[PDB]
Structures are given as structure tokens and as C-alpha cells.
């Protein structure tokens, strides 16, 4: 029974390893999202689809 319990404990540790891997992947993904949002902002500012002007009055 103790052999089986320790084997299950190794299983839980392996599951923790999997969780850490997924957390790392998610962190890199959300860094990519942040870079994408920065590009969205700089595209909105610089875009050629705008036509307004600073007026003289």
C-alpha cells in the first residue's frame, strides 16, 4: 500500500510539473498579447485612414 501511495504521490508531482509548463506557456502568450496591443495602439495613432486636421480659428 505504501508503494502504491508513493507512486500516486509521484503522479501528483508530475501533474504539478504539467501545471507549471502550462503556466509558462500562458505567460509567454499574454506577453505576446501585450505586444499585439502595443502594435494596435501605434497603428491607430499612425494610420492613414484618418482625415481630421488641427484647425485655424
Amino acid at each position: 500500500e505504501l508503494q502504491a501511495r508513493i507512486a500516486g504521490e509521484q503522479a501528483a508531482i508530475q501533474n504539478e510539473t504539467t501545471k507549471l509548463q502550462m503556466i509558462a506557456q500562458l505567460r509567454q502568450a499574454e506577453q505576446a498579447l501585450i505586444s499585439e496591443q502595443r502594435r494596435e495602439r501605434n497603428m491607430r495613432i499612425l494610420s492613414s485612414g484618418n482625415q481630421g486636421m488641427p484647425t485655424i480659428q
Binding site: L46, N50, G52, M53, P54
Partner: peptide
């Protein structure tokens, strides 16, 4: 007057 009117946002074409 002209350049105080100027603002850097998504409304006025910055190149213009």
C-alpha cells in the same frame, strides 16, 4: 493657434 489645436490621437492624421 494652429499648433495648440494640434493633438496626437486617433482623429487627426499625424502626417497631415
Amino acid at each position: 493657434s494652429y499648433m495648440a489645436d494640434l493633438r496626437f490621437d486617433g482623429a487627426q492624421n499625424v502626417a497631415y
